[PDB]
């Protein structure tokens, strides 16, 4: 078991993302390093829901803690543009895990 339940998916229609600068950029549809192009896909993992149990994450000490499952993001490099100019590889934020957030009381 986990404190939070996550689910994974192959994302094939990402057209926009926030990059490491905190700016919105366009994510291109495909890539080319070798002989032919490769469509640009991402492997994402997100929370199934915010409260897998009534009071939040599973296994939390209800009396002393508030809790909530949250989707966390990581950086991956992606071929990107800015209003179809300045095409290049940028570090962008994508859903990568589900983490339990805590606060006393």
């Amino acid at each position, epitope marked *: 078991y986990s404190v939070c339940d996550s689910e994974s998916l192959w994302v094939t229609d990402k057209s926009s993302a926030i990059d*490491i600068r905190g700016h919105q950029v366009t994510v291109l549809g495909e890539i080319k390093t070798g002989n032919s192009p490769v469509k640009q896909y991402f492997y994402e993992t997100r929370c199934k829901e915010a409260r897998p149990v009534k009071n939040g994450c599973r296994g939390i000490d209800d009396k002393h803690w508030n809790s909530q499952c949250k989707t966390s993001q990581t950086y991956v490099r992606a071929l*990107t543009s800015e209003n179809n100019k*300045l095409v290049g*590889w*940028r570090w962008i934020r994508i859903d990568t895990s589900c983490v339990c957030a805590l606060s006393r009381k």
Partner: antibody
Amino acid sequence: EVQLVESGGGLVKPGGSLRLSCAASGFTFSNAWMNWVRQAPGKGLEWVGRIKSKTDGGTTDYAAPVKGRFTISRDDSKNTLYLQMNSLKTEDTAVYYCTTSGGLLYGSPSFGDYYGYWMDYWGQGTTVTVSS
Amino acid sequence: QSVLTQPPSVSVAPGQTARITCGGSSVGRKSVHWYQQSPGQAPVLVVYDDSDRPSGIPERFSGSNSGDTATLTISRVEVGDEADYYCQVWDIDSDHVVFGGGTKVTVLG
């Protein structure tokens, strides 16, 4: 206007020592991070080291080829930056520039910070020649 | 200690556009600053944070960042722009400010 005036350059033999000064004016020197940057004759710019403001801890960091031989210090009551160069090497021959850092909104930059930390003022430099 | 790479030289005629690229190191993870060094003078900041211009720098000087590479573009070049241009980044992987090797911009006046 901001002024940075380096002094103390000169010619020494390998293994000698020199002490560079940089007299600053026209800005709150005590709030600025200060750097030394050098340029060997006919080559590019090379960061030598930095000293933080006292607010941000007043600590120093040095470039790899200079660590253990050079010491940066500052005297806020005289608005002066110092570079103590001991055990000099011929590779240390360069013009030495004094530099302020700008774009520090949050004190010491964090791991995730993308923007900030440029060199907004440079002095005109002092020449150090190390030759046998 | 990581290598910020620039072409060593660019020649341009007055009125034309000069372009200086910079890659490697922490480009894409930390912003790029650009310095102009005229012969016999100290460097001068001409672009900061990829694309911002300090006060007093002509609008002809603009920088851009394409993620893995950064470009300084000097439009309507003048003979006064003949200088060495250096890009600069904070290198995460070695805890150093690092500069590119420098690009000598020759203006054919």
